[PDB]
């Protein structure tokens, strides 16, 4: 899985995101709903309009989940535990959508962290998001 | 691929400011770097053993320019991406035997490269318009299969 | 989709022996059972909480018959799977908003169902011919996207 | 991951495969090369003709890997350990191909075990193969 180099690359990049984690998270979500409309069938009770307080509020929750995944990068399973049943069992989210969010998240990061989004850090985040997604879908198989 | 007058402007306006030289190899490099299994198709390019290695690798920079060209060509004939990529399809499908999924990956890395390059200008709407294009190219490139 | 005289016979000869009734719902059930997230599209079918539950579920058996029909229809117009599924595309794409990947899954479950049903008759070559078809249907069904 | 029910469903089905594990494995490979030709770019030094001794010999190795994954179903990572670097690092196998083999393997099993290949056992094997693949690609992220 995530190597020592990846682990440090992830921590660094997220450190930069800093207090913006919540707004970047709201931005990724918006990018997804726009570029990938099928993912909206999951937020019907949401006003997905641009300056939607609901979207902004959820982007914060997503960002904090990710912050926690990083803080416990060596034990994401036990940590993300709850989030796994919610997504996998409760909402039964199509696994393929995790790929779409992960992509919009990298797009968001690349549009804010020009200095940090190097090839290596890029692959690292990919692996990281790849792992986080694996856990959130771990309840499927 | 459709594309509304708005989606058309957003894409074209942005595409005009692209650097045919840099951007080209940047997408290809990251691909090989982020999705290592892709290197198996460019062993005749030398040392790809490391990011700096591939990122600097001149064969990459060079081929990436050709890929960028291929896209520019697609943006011009969105109405007929099929005939536009017909020869490219044969090449990658019958000859090279690359799996379509990897075309999708290249489109997405391209998208990342552009977001990185343009930053705050690559608004969500611009991205959506570009995902449409990339989706269209990837499908056309993989037509020599279905 | 192409299909050679040999691939044509292999498919058609086998398809003729299919049970329009059973086979139909068998594929749909396994789909919902193997890929649980698909159930979200058939909540109005009742208890799908368990295999026996969905496998016996009459709404499934019934809808599966319609799906089988759709395929039979595709096998008849392999030359024009596009126009053949045009209405179905709109339905699943614009209306339902199902992701293409899941169409691929249904094709593969179909393939499994048939192998199970025909056993040793479903030789590798027969499968390859059928993967071609399924691939063709899945692409046509998802045309209202690209 | 694999639940108690899955674990037992997997053991049972593989028990049936029995001494045929090697021939079913050769059959899956053949199905893959036929239905999914891109996967052949990985076996160029192979005579993929039908009654190929090489294919038959490799189907045996694949089957034994799977037999071991099952025997150590609770520790596939450490067990499949070697197979992971070979595939991920050495051969750098495109992850998507693991999906194609897993599908042909289920097709092969369904064509030999009509009584056992029930919906539930089917989902189980899927989850199992899903997991085995995850490990063999674990070296990517
Ligand atoms: C990067 C992976 C993801 C993370 C970290 C994430 C995180 C979360 C978090 C923190 C919540 C809040 C739940 C709570 O309040 O306990 C949640 C809920 C949910 N997530 Fe995600 N999520 C992920 C991917 C997805 C995907 C791919 C979809 C589907 C397109 C999705 C759809 C939902 C839905 C619909 C809910 C419920 C929203 C509601 O409360 O009405 N999530 N997720
Ligand atoms: C995403 C869309 C893609 C575009 C537009 C594209 C475009 C091209 C072009 C313009 C060429 C040069 C052909 C020529 O010289 O006439 C080419 C060659 C090649 N492409 Fe791609 N390509 C795409 C995706 C891929 C992917 C994903 C791979 C897989 C690793 C790939 C592997 C190759 C290889 C190995 C060659 C070298 C053949 C040579 O020596 O010319 N391509 N591609
Ligand atoms: C693989 C190819 C598929 C075929 C050939 C197919 C065919 C059909 C047909 C024939 C109908 C009935 C439409 C009508 O009444 O006129 C239908 C309805 C429907 N399909 Fe599919 N389908 C496919 C894949 C999928 C997939 C993967 C899903 C995703 C869960 C799906 C979800 C639905 C739903 C929910 C309906 C119900 C709409 C209604 O009430 O009629 N279909 N499909
Ligand atoms: C179900 C997952 C798989 C299992 C259990 C499996 C198992 C194995 C085993 C046991 C070997 C023998 C290596 C040795 O002698 O140490 C091997 C080698 C290899 N595998 Fe797989 N494999 C899997 C998937 C794949 C896939 C998806 C591909 C690519 C299409 C693939 C391509 C190869 C290649 C090319 C080799 C080297 C063959 C050679 O010795 O020339 N394998 N695999």
UniProtKB/Swiss-Prot annotation, chains A, D:
Effect of residue 97 to K: In Dallas; O(2) affinity up
Mutagenesis / variant outcome for changing residue 6 to Y: In Woodville; O(2) affinity up
Entry GO terms, CC: blood microparticle; cytosol; endocytic vesicle lumen; extracellular exosome; extracellular region; extracellular space; haptoglobin-hemoglobin complex; hemoglobin complex
Tissues where this protein is expressed: Red blood cells.
Impact noted for substituting residue 141 to C: In Nunobiki; O(2) affinity up
Regions crossing the membrane: none
Residues where heme b binds: 87
Effect of residue 90 to M: In Handa; O(2) affinity up
Reported effect, residue 110 to D: In Petah Tikva; unstable; causes alpha-thalassemia
Miscellaneous notes: Gives blood its red color.
Protein name, as recorded: Hemoglobin subunit alpha
Organism of origin: Homo sapiens (Human)
Lineage: Eukaryota, Metazoa, Chordata, Craniata, Vertebrata
From Swiss-Prot, chains B, C:
Result for mutant: residue 32 to V: In Muscat; slightly unstable
Modified residues (N6-acetyllysine): 59, 82, 144
Recorded consequence of changing residue 124 to Q: In Ty Gard; O(2) affinity up
Resulting phenotype, residue 51 to R: In Willamette; O(2) affinity up; unstable
Effect on the protein of changing residue 132 to Q: In K-Woolwich
Pfam families: Globin
Consequence when changing residue 112 to R: In Indianapolis
Keyword vocabulary terms for this entry: Acetylation, Congenital dyserythropoietic anemia, Disease variant, Glycation, Glycoprotein, Heme, Hereditary hemolytic anemia, Hypotensive agent, Iron, Metal-binding, Oxygen transport, Phosphoprotein, Pyruvate, S-nitrosylation, Transport, Vasoactive
Effect of residue 96 to V: In Regina; O(2) affinity up
Mutagenesis / variant outcome for changing residue 59 to E: In I-High Wycombe
Phenotype upon changing residue 66 to I: In Vigo; O(2) affinity down
Signal peptide, first to last residue: none
Effect after changing residue 94 to N: In Bunbury; O(2) affinity up
Entry protein name: Hemoglobin subunit beta
Organism name: Homo sapiens
